[PDB]
Write a protein that binds this DNA or RNA. Structure first.
Ligand SMILES: [Zn+2]
Ligand SMILES: [Zn+2]
Ligand SMILES: [Zn+2]
Ligand SMILES: [Zn+2]
Lengths: 201, 199, 202, 199
DNA sequence: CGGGCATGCCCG
DNA sequence: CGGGCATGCCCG
DNA sequence: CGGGCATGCCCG
DNA sequence: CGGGCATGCCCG
């Protein structure tokens, strides 16, 4: 209905929260998050796990929506899709049941549904919200990205921003958080450099 | 003829603002607080944030119209220099009037209006409430000739007036700010603020 | 069926075709100036620009001479040379109208000046008949007129152009051809002097 | 037939030549005599000078065929990567199959060829006599992908094989040269020669 | 008729 | 995202 | 317009 | 596992 995904955090009634645990001081590390720059550094198609949390059990049939947007205004109008070279390829499109075009995928959850909103044209994947696990503090949705931040054709070196939403069976918004995403060949280097430049300021 | 470039918040405190875009010679867009100056780059995306605390006239809408500052010119209309109006540069691909100066980018309900006997050009969008969690409705504008175009604004400054209205024309509010469309806002902003300050 | 990329290459034919330029103002704001060092004229939009034609032997009746512009740089070579959309319609010189304002090159005076618009190549030019040099005159003088400032947007913007003069037969042929960089601007002298210096640095 | 190559001047000595280019490192194109390698930026106009000794036959023409160098990749046909193919940028007029690497501009008589089952793509154009008072027949080519393109030439050196031939299949003109498509050609060129001199 | 500037654009 | 030139045009 | 950086991936 | 490299692109 709306073509400019709201970017602003807003926990809402319940206190929707997104956090990343595992850390890896390496360069070719599948994934690693930078708290100082609220930016996730993930590799191509590598298992990326984020952890959701809330204070009170949300309404029945709630959802978790993950959708990509561009950080800059000049680009934000353009739908974030998978580049031709990675779309038409066999690798990962061979019997996966997820639209070749989709950038973000959800790993290990049949209940996950990929969405192409017909008017907006935006793409996003959803899963029913889950109560953590009995002995855990958070809910672990584990995501995937199928294009580097620099894929000529798709992203094209443009910075994105993954937005995680706590939704109603109908769409009404109960929560939201966001952060910058940069898919690389190796997040060790990329992250350090960006935090060293931040330190350089 | 000659809309009222006169400020008026109205009933619902109307606040159109700008974010913190960086200062850089060739920055796509930048805004000055000392002056009400929007330094803009041709055809680039310029995000302008509109805040409204109590919004409730469904069918209400927001207009953006361009006007000349100096009085002798304010009676003249703000069109595009025939060079860009005729050129193939930004005119194909879009579904917006060849001659208007202002264009909305992230919206398709937009209305480019050519006043029948007024001759003023402006573009209206519907007022959409800010999305749950944030405070301002964000409209995306881009200007299609540089302020210095011969055949158009022959270097004469222009003011932009954003009016929120009732489905049937009735100005609930309005605001203004001078805008400049140049190759590099950063170097132009730096200079403008300097000369005015000195005096 | 025509030639796609008019060659600029000079051609002194059986007749000895030459294109000379008389003494010109070194004056900064000059109406027109020339450069044999940089072999390029510098003329003002819509100002009378003289040109000296010369030949050892005289050619047959019906023989005329063609002036056509073409971009100097290859990545621009294919674009035809027309006037900026602005000037082509601009009411400031289509009045006292005579020829299509598409055309950049016009001819002053001569009423035998018929323009061309090659349907095939969509190429624009202009042609007048070869009158033998005025009695006691070495040169057959044709006035060419240029309409857009080499820096006009929409039109040839800041993209150098070449002006090919062609000693052409009565019907489709080439007997002689000489070329030379054209540069339309506001300060012909300020420009030429700035150009030649820049050259006297290499 | 498939991977030809060996030069062959022929009846009318076929000579492929390049004019003097821009010394600049990021120029549209440059040719390296010592390295018999053409360096040009993607989609930029590359002029090539074709010459012959005697008025070649009647309805004869010229064709450009690109082939991978390494004796390994010869098998593989050389086309545009998926991205530059299904991408807007240069297919919005396309009197040229979006798949072809080599393209000709200016000429309307260009014909793009796809071999039957052993399909190789190429561009041909009727040969034309040098315009009166010139010795060079000039053809303006375009190279739609970068030799670095992942999914395309994927950094695989290639040869453009120019051949003069007669409609009746008789190929009696064969001149070939190395071709590299890249962002700034001067740089790679000087880098290519610098080291080969030393190594 | 030359000096000088503003602002687009390309390059020490 | 900074330094410096282009080149139409105004000044006087 | 050249010098420097960005960024997938080669190499050991 | 990281350091260094080529190659497209942006900063000054
Ligand atoms: Zn991709
Ligand atoms: Zn304009
Ligand atoms: Zn013009
Ligand atoms: Zn490619």
């Amino acid at each position: 209905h709306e073509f400019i995904p709201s970017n602003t955090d807003y926990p809402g009634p319940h206190h929707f929260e997104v956090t990343f645990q595992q850390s890896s001081t390496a360069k070719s590390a599948t994934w690693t998050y930078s708290p100082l720059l609220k930016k996730l550094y993930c590799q191509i198609a590598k298992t990326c796990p984020i952890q959701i949390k809330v204070s009170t059990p949300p309404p029945p049939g709630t959802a978790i929506r993950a959708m990509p947007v561009y950080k800059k205004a000049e680009h934000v109008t353009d739908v974030v899709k998978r580049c031709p070279n990675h779309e038409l390829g066999r690798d990962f499109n061979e019997g996966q049941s997820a639209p070749a075009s989709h950038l973000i995928r959800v790993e290990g959850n049949n209940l996950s549904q990929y969405v192409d909103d017909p008017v907006t044209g935006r793409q996003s994947v959803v899963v029913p919200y889950e109560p953590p696990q009995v002995g855990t503090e958070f809910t672990t949705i584990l995501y995937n990205f199928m294009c580097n931040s620099s894929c000529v054709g798709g992203m094209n070196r443009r910075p994105i921003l993954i937005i995680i939403t706590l939704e109603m069976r109908d769409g009404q918004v109960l929560g939201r958080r966001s952060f910058e995403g940069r898919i690389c060949a190796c997040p060790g280097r990329d992250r350090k450099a960006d935090e060293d430049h931040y330190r350089e300021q």
